[PDB]
Amino acid sequence: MKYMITSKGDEKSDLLRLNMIAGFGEYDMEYDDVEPEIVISIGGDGTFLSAFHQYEERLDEIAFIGIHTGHLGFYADWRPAEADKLVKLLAKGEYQKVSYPLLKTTVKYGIEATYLALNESTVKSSGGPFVVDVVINDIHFERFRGDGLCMSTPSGTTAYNKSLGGALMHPSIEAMQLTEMASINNRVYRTIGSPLVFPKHHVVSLQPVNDKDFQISVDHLSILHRDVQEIRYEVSAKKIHFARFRSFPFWRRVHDSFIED
Amino acid sequence: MKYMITSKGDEKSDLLRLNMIAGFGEYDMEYDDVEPEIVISIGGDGTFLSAFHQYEERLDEIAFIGIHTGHLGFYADWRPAEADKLVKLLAKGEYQKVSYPLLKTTVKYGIEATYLALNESTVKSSGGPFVVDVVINDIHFERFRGDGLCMSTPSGTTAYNKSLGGALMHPSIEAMQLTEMASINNRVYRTIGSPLVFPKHHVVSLQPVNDKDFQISVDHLSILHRDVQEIRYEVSAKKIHFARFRSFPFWRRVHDSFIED
Amino acid sequence: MKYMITSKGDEKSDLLRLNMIAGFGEYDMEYDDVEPEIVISIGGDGTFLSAFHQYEERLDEIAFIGIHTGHLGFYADWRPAEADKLVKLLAKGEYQKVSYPLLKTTVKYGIEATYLALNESTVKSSGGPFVVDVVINDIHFERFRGDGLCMSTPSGTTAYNKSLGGALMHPSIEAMQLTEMASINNRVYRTIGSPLVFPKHHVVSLQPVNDKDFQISVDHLSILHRDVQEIRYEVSAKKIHFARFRSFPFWRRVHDSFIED
Amino acid sequence: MKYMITSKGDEKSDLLRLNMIAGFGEYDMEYDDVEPEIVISIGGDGTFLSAFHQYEERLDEIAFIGIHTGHLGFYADWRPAEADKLVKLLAKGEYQKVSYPLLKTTVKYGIEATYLALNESTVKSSGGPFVVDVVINDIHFERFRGDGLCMSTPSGTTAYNKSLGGALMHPSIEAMQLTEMASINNRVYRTIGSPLVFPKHHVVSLQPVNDKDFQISVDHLSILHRDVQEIRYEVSAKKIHFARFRSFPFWRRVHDSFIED
């Protein structure tokens, strides 16, 4: 079965990668980083995010696995010590796959670009004050004034979304969540304040009021977009697929990362 | 078609009720408060909540409609001025129904009681410190120390849940949301802090650590339960059905209640 | 020098107390629990709070010391292992005293009671909805609707106040801080949301709107007051005095209790 | 008496300025924008902030007055309609002055710059992750990871500080308040979370961990500083002085701006 392995690139991760490749050499496994069916990420969540984006055009054909040699490792299911066990289990395969929802971002300009996010997409201004009209299914909902906004996938809810006061949501829920960054609320300016959770097929559109340049982030990447007419958020029809070899429930994953381990 | 009408019981609501009954008298409509098919609530959200609980054994057979003569009226779809229009539309009927999810609470004792909630169920102690173990699908998630906990339905997310920092969630999502009330967090005591959103079939169990007496609220009602072994939360298989005669989207409803109207 | 020792009353705390008394027996120290000059509390912060309230009529004549045999021990400056060192240092004395500000609560009835708080005073309703008008120096500031309110001293800011989202304030600042418990905010009801910090000589008055019965807590104690006309908060002219034998800065105390130790 | 007038520069503000100058022409008043004793700002709070910074070297010799022709106008004490009344009152003078505290920011480099703030000073990274060690009076308090930090004066507490969850503090308190922007908190990273309120003479030092370039804002102005060794916050010994002609208490000012007016 075709596979590839990304590494965070420190000594520990590179050696683990070389050892797994050698172990894979003893099975019917072909290393192919053009059309892998299995993508193994060795590092932290940042390494995993880069792996996802390296293959976002073949998400339907790929199952991902994370090994944590980083610090927190939320998308990670394996410690390095279980690597040979994972080689052996991946060989002979017949594992189960689980799918998490993704967020689609569309950026339209004056005179379209689309992005897929595993954690979140955020919008801030390019220096000046950030002011957008928030339009939900063509209904004008609020005029947001503040630092910015964050639209999170379910598995992203434990990331930036959490730091912004968002809810943690189980990834079996096909939804996206919008959180505020430092909104202004006085006699003159009013936002909802609360995080908002949207189902599939709801469309959230941000429309500039004055300045039309924004800093748009998708996961680890942040780009200055100029002459923006609209930013559009919706739950993607695409999903990321994980190879799972044992039970590691999301809420236990949350417990292990935030409560104690 | 069998119907009944509850009133908040002030002069304005009673007269509106008498006028609608008289208007219904001109159609094939039978006033029946034992087995109504249509339940009209005239008042505020508290009146609507009481109407729901008055008929929680026949939720499958009933479509609800709220008229607001109260203050905020979140479950309300009609102003009093549209009552005769509603009489006429309900007559000839063939409206569409929409369903919102409900929360099931199970309270087990030493030596079972179940409740259905349209807004939320909360737990506090009976005086002493509130300490429970939070168990999610049999996995020990956290030991909660604080004032109490709140488990909200989707349509309840705009109520107590919102004041506790919870997310607002569209009611097409079959989920429940757990929020903390004033948790303690120091070197010794740790909670997740964040609201948690659970899908159908997930079970959240609260288990006492020391004191076993709790004040349990379901919507407007609050009961002291003694000798509690477990409180169990799950998304109910039952749903509340609304009669809808025009589009009034949830997010517009949220806008009208919190942003401006 | 006259002294007394309170104990949490578990085996560890009682024995430590008996050993310190025996050690004090070797100096010019007289055990007197009617008019002590030194009050030693052996336990946790709850034990310390009870010690403070046991002698709140002689705060001017007393210096307090806390020894932690409890769990967190925020008012504690000594581990049990340093008890004999403390006996010896207290003997020969000439320590320095530090003073923390206190909160005065006045409860007036239809047809006056005053309380002193080291941590905080809170107000909730006696069952029904909690609604009070908040009056600051005779200026009507807001109508608060919600679960309740909390007025904290500086040293209390790390306690209930912290769980309610309040700021942590250094106790050299003569101030009190008001935090909200789960306020309602919609089109119809509005509160400031933010914690408020008041200086000396500012008076914050809570005035009932409908129900006049409230559950008023002062530190560990909670009393049902009936027929309340007004609850009045002000920074007390009285201060609690600590005996300090070494530097243990407040911000280090905060670090040790919340960050790591 | 020497005076000058700044304008927001829209038609309404320029004409009001020309009319006040003409009215001042009828008294013993000399227009002098080099060494004014009175500085009148006509606009919003942004105009007032620019006026303050235009004369921050002569704060001891100047009393400020704000007239609001902008939107919210928190530092404003006059509506345009009261301008001639203000001309007349300023003439004959003998008003009272009130002083608000200020924040001093010191930025030290490898191989010193100081700033004065009326609202706040904030720090963010120059692109990469923001990580600083927070040192309070030479005691290492926490390692902050997140979007940034905000240090607010008392009168600044109603501004950015409020949006970040900070407490509102009366400006008679000589203090500064530190709030977090989106801190990370998991098993590995821990911050205090809560706003911190510091008295005079306490020094809060931010020390870089990896990246040494930061975006530092003081009130309306934001500068990229490179090769930073330390950012130092302390309550300034300098104060801003306001000319007050009538009672407009801070808490009423807060009420008028956030509750209703």
Ligand SMILES: Nc1ncnc2c1ncn2[C@@H]1O[C@H](COCC#Cc2nc3c(N)ncnc3n2[C@@H]2O[C@H](CNS34(O)(O)CN3C4)[C@@H](O)[C@H]2O)[C@@H](O)[C@H]1O
């Ligand atoms: N202010 C902020 N607060 C909180 N998160 C923020 C903030 N700004 C940006 N992010 C996040 O960064 C991500 C990019 O980096 C890779 C990742 C991830 C990551 N995913 C998750 C996840 N699903 N659940 C739990 N933890 C996660 N992580 C953990 O997030 C930490 C982030 N490293 S970080 O340096 O803290 C400021 N960070 C650059 C690590 O622990 C990592 O394990 C973006 O997708 C934002 O979600």
Ligand SMILES: Nc1ncnc2c1ncn2[C@@H]1O[C@H](COCC#Cc2nc3c(N)ncnc3n2[C@@H]2O[C@H](CNS34(O)(O)CN3C4)[C@@H](O)[C@H]2O)[C@@H](O)[C@H]1O
């Ligand atoms: N601290 C709290 N903060 C916020 N809500 C709280 C708190 N405590 C209890 N509740 C709530 O009360 C309900 C019982 O009363 C009837 C209802 C309702 C109600 N449903 C909703 C809803 N789905 N969406 C928006 N607003 C709603 N309302 C509005 O809630 C106000 C409540 N009246 S109230 O007096 O405020 C303290 N209240 C007794 C009214 O405006 C009403 O229209 C419980 O089911 C709790 O959800």
Ligand SMILES: Nc1ncnc2c1ncn2[C@@H]1O[C@H](COCC#Cc2nc3c(N)ncnc3n2[C@@H]2O[C@H](CNS34(O)(O)CN3C4)[C@@H](O)[C@H]2O)[C@@H](O)[C@H]1O
């Ligand atoms: N929801 C709440 N969240 C947070 N605190 C709450 C809440 N409700 C009430 N309180 C508090 O309880 C106090 C009475 O008890 C004694 C004390 C104290 C105490 N003082 C402090 C302090 N200055 N700084 C840091 N920690 C403190 N402590 C620590 O507070 C814990 C409290 N034990 S507790 O059981 O948690 C719900 N608690 C009864 C212990 O760790 C103790 O060391 C009241 O004066 C409220 O301030």
Ligand SMILES: Nc1ncnc2c1ncn2[C@@H]1O[C@H](COCC#Cc2nc3c(N)ncnc3n2[C@@H]2O[C@H](CNS34(O)(O)CN3C4)[C@@H](O)[C@H]2O)[C@@H](O)[C@H]1O
């Ligand atoms: N995310 C944020 N949330 C909240 N405030 C933020 C945020 N970012 C920056 N600031 C603030 O901006 C200031 C610079 O501008 C001038 C000012 C002021 C200003 N002072 C105050 C004050 N003492 N009390 C109450 N309101 C104030 N104002 C009101 O602040 C609004 C700000 N205009 S704004 O565009 O909102 C994002 N703003 C550029 C206006 O209403 C104004 O009247 C900085 O000193 C930050 O304090």
